Amino acid sequence: NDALNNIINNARDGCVPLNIIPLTTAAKLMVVIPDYNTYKNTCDGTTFTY
Amino acid sequence: RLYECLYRNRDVDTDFVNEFYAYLRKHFSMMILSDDAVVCFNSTYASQGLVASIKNFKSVLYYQNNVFMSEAKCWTETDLTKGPHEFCSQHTMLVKQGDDYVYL
Amino acid sequence: AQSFLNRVCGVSAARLTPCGTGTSTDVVYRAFDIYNDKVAGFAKFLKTNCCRFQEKDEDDNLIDSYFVVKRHTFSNYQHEETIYNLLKDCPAVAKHDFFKFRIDGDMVPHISRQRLTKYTMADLVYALRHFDEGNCDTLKEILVTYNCCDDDYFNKKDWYDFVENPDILRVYANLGERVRQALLKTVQFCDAMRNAGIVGVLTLDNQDLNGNWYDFGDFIQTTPGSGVPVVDSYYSLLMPILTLTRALTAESHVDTDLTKPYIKWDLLKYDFTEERLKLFDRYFKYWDQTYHPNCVNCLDDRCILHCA
Amino acid sequence: NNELSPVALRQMSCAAGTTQTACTDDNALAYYNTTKGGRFVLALLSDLQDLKWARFPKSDGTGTIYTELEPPCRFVTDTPKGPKVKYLYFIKGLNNLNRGMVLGSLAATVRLQ
Ligand SMILES: Nc1nc2c(ncn2[C@@H]2O[C@H](COP(=O)(O)OP(=O)(O)NP(=O)(O)O)[C@@H](O)[C@H]2O)c(=O)[nH]1
Ligand SMILES: [Mg+2]
Ligand SMILES: [Zn+2]
Numbered sequence: 001n002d003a004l005n006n007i008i009n010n011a012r013d014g015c016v017p018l019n020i021i022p023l024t025t026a027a028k029l030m031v032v033i034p035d036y037n038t039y040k041n042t043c044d045g046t047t048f049t050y
Numbered sequence: 051r052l053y054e055c056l057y058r059n060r061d062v063d064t065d066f067v068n069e070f071y072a073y074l075r076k077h078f079s080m081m082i083l084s085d086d087a088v089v090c091f092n093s094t095y096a097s098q099g100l101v102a103s104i105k106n107f108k109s110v111l112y113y114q115n116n117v118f119m120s121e122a123k124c125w126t127e128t129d130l131t132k133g134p135h136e137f138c139s140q141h142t143m144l145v146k147q148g149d150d151y152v153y154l
Numbered sequence: 155a156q157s158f159l160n161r162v163c164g165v166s167a168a169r170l171t172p173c174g175t176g177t178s179t180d181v182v183y184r185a186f187d188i189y190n191d192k193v194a195g196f197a198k199f200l201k202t203n204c205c206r207f208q209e210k211d212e213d214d215n216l217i218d219s220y221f222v223v224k225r226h227t228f229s230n231y232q233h234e235e236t237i238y239n240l241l242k243d244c245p246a247v248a249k250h251d252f253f254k255f256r257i258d259g260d261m262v263p264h265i266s267r268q269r270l271t272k273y274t275m276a277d278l279v280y281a282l283r284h285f286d287e288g289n290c291d292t293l294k295e296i297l298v299t300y301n302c303c304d305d306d307y308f309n310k311k312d313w314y315d316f317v318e319n320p321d322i323l324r325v326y327a328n329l330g331e332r333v334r335q336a337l338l339k340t341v342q343f344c345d346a347m348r349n350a351g352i353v354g355v356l357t358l359d360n361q362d363l364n365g366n367w368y369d370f371g372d373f374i375q376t377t378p379g380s381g382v383p384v385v386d387s388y389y390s391l392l393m394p395i396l397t398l399t400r401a402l403t404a405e406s407h408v409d410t411d412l413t414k415p416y417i418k419w420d421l422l423k424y425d426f427t428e429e430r431l432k433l434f435d436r437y438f439k440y441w442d443q444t445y446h447p448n449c450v451n452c453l454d455d456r457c458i459l460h461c462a
Numbered sequence: 463n464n465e466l467s468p469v470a471l472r473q474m475s476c477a478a479g480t481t482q483t484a485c486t487d488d489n490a491l492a493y494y495n496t497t498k499g500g501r502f503v504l505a506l507l508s509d510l511q512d513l514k515w516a517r518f519p520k521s522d523g524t525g526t527i528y529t530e531l532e533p534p535c536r537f538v539t540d541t542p543k544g545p546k547v548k549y550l551y552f553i554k555g556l557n558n559l560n561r562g563m564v565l566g567s568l569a570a571t572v573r574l575q
Contacts, residue, residue: 011422020421053194057387060557065498105286112285113394118315191468353565355464372465374569377537382561387464442558 001025077101081137088134161255162207162221162266169210170221177257179225180206185280187357187387196280196391202226209269218299223266230371231263237352237370244346246339248366267368272299275336276359278329279392287314300363302328329399331412332363337401337437339365344383344440351378356388385440405433470567471496471504478506478516478531485517485528490551492516493564505564506531506551513551530554540573 003025008016029050033039042048052070055063078101081088089102096103104126108119125135133142133153142153158177159170174180179201186199204222211217231252238250251266273296281292297303303325312318340361347354354373361367376382396402408414430447438445445461452458476492479485489510495502506516511534519526534549550568552561568574 007422015424016422017424024421053189057390058559109283109285113283113398116316116398118317186463188463190463190465353466353562353569355466355562357464372463374466374566375574376565376569377535377574380535382558382565384466384559384562386559440558 001027083138086138088137090130158255159207161253162223162251164251164266164268166268167209171208171210171216173206173208173220177205179203184274184359185276186359187276187391198280218271220270220272221266221268222270223264224369225262225264226371228263231265233373234265234369234371236375237373240350240352240375241346241370244342246342246365246367247346248362248368250368265369270366270368271362271364273363274359275361275363275392276357278363279358279395282398283391283394285314290314297325297329300329300332302326326398327400327403330401330403333395333399333401334404335365336361336363340367340385340388341437341439343367344385347383348381349379350381351376352381354382355384358388358391383440389438389441402433402437466566467563470563476503476506476516476518478508478513478529480512480514482515482528485515489513490516493567495560503529503553504560505556506553507568508534508549508551509546511549516551516553537574540575545575 004021007021007024008014031043033042042050051066055066077092077095079090091101095101104121104124107124108121111117111119127135131144133144135141144151144153146152155177159172160168163170181201182204183198183200184202185196187196188194188199203225205225207221207223208216209219209221234250235252238247238252241247248270249268251268252263253266254261254263256262273292277292278296281290281296285293294305294308298305307313307325310319314322316322340356344356352370352373353376354370360369404410404412406416408417427447431445434441434445443460444457446452446457447461449458449461452461471494473491473493475488476490477485477487478490489508490513491507493504493507495504500521503516503518506513508531513531516529516531517526518529530553531551532554534551536547536549539546539548550564552564
């Protein structure tokens with residue numbers, strides 16, 4: 001994607017850590033919730049922010 | 051000299067390393083596999099804290115490995131005529147084979 | 155008689171309670187770090203000739219602060235007098251009080267310390283490094299006194315365990331700030347000791363839990379600007395604690411204060427080579443051994459151990 | 463009790479100078495560590511102001527070792543001569559504990575003002 005270019009071109013060198021590429025570029029999130037209590041504090045409603 | 055070479059000094063003291071190794075192998079005979087150990091030690095020393103005991107491994111595991119050694123997984127025997135209470139999950143029995151006595 | 159108690163309190167806070175018997179010493183069981191010329195070790199010995207008095211807070215309840223007056227040697231008396239006179243202006247030095255009280259026919263000298271804490275740092279380090287649940291009363295007291303827990307926590311049997319009761323870390327971590335303060339004040343101590351021209355060897359049982367330092371009985375003098383502190387048992391014995399109690403947790407906050415948000419590092423910044431050196435220069439300044447932030451520059455395997 | 467130096471070691475005069483060949487002959491007073499794995503010089507007491515390179519021939523004579531005398535330490539002493547304006551040089555890369563032993567033994571047996 002173009003977001004990969006935007007995130008790499010702004011590195012001081014061009015080497016970005018691996019655990020931030022999906023964080024700031026992935027186009028789909030997958031949550032796994034064990035019980036309703038955790039569901040209420042994570043994915044309540046149609047929209048949520050992570 | 052152990053404290054001296056431990057904290058004061060900075061480089062190896064292979065004379066004293068050899069000395070300590072000799073002392074250990076003379077008073078702390080050992081048998082190892084991947085974490086399944088057996089230790090035969092002089093007892094009239096460990097009763098005075100001159101060598102390791104079974105509480106000392108508890109303390110070391112506590113402050114370094116960050117686990118508590120419950121005193122129901124580590125045993126201790128006192129009559130060598132019967133071998134280790136358990137090693138590699140096999141008990142040891144002293145029986146008569148032929149003319150002599152063997153451990154199976 | 156009783157005027158001894160009037161002399162000890164001196165000018166500050168005469169709410170004395172004798173914790174001994176009369177004017178006689180008080181035998182104890184503390185963890186030293188002796189190495190003179192005949193004995194080494196890190197074991198519990200017994201009393202340094204200390205008479206101890208406890209200060210009363212208002213409402214006549216007892217508070218953790220003591221006046222430990224020793225009774226050892228005139229030559230050591232003047233020796234300590236001179237070192238204290240040189241070393242006084244530092245904030246991390248606990249206020250001595252040298253006086254001369256008469257017992258029977260002898261102006262026996264005393265060193266009446268001021269506002270101490272019942273347990274030093276060597277006691278914490280020992281009783282946490284030589285753990286024994288059979289008798290961990292000292293750890294119990296040290297835990298309850300500094301508001302880390304309450305006595306009712308110690309009835310939940312298997313409280314010390316790490317596998318079960320994983321909450322015990324939250325009890326230990328609350329001892330964080332105190333240890334941090336010790337480190338900081340220790341650093342300042344070294345600075346003073348260097349700038350005054352003093353040769354001295356530092357130990358963990360020379361430090362109340364607040365951070366202060368005391369009893370420089372075995373020091374010597376040099377020319378100013380050319381002092382040396384010897385920190386090789388102190389730091390090294392203390393090392394296994396700063397990860398049990400998460401001693402550096404107060405370093406991801408915006409200004410290293412517990413009542414602030416977290417520092418938000420940039421997403422892509424990975425080097426963290428100057429931060430490590432700043433942390434080293436703040437906390438461990440007199441660890442006279444090169445610390446390479448990246449181990450690729452190490453010389454042999456032992457230096458790799460020392461930098462990892 | 464954590465005592466700095468319970469009994470100490472000895473001294474001999476040695477050769478030193480400014481640069482590599484500037485080491486002429488005996489111009490120093492060196493405390494040394496007599497270990498069974500060879501003698502390790504501890505400290506250099508000098509009456510010259512700027513030395514940087516000391517030298518001692520190895521025990522077999524074939525080789526000689528050089529020591530960088532890093533920046534000195536001013537002091538003055540009491541003697542029948544009176545004030546002795548001397549400088550303490552340590553071999554570059556001396557641990558704090560060895561500096562402690564050197565200075566402790568000096569101030570114990572050598573008079574300072
Ligand atoms: N914190 C604390 N320590 C006490 C108390 N009573 C006795 N002590 C002991 O007294 C010690 C004071 O140090 P002390 O041995 O007198 O001096 P030092 O610096 O350790 N060594 P040196 O005697 O050579 O100067 C503490 O480390 C501790 O072990 C007390 O009520 N509180
Ligand atoms: Mg004392
Ligand atoms: Zn290194």
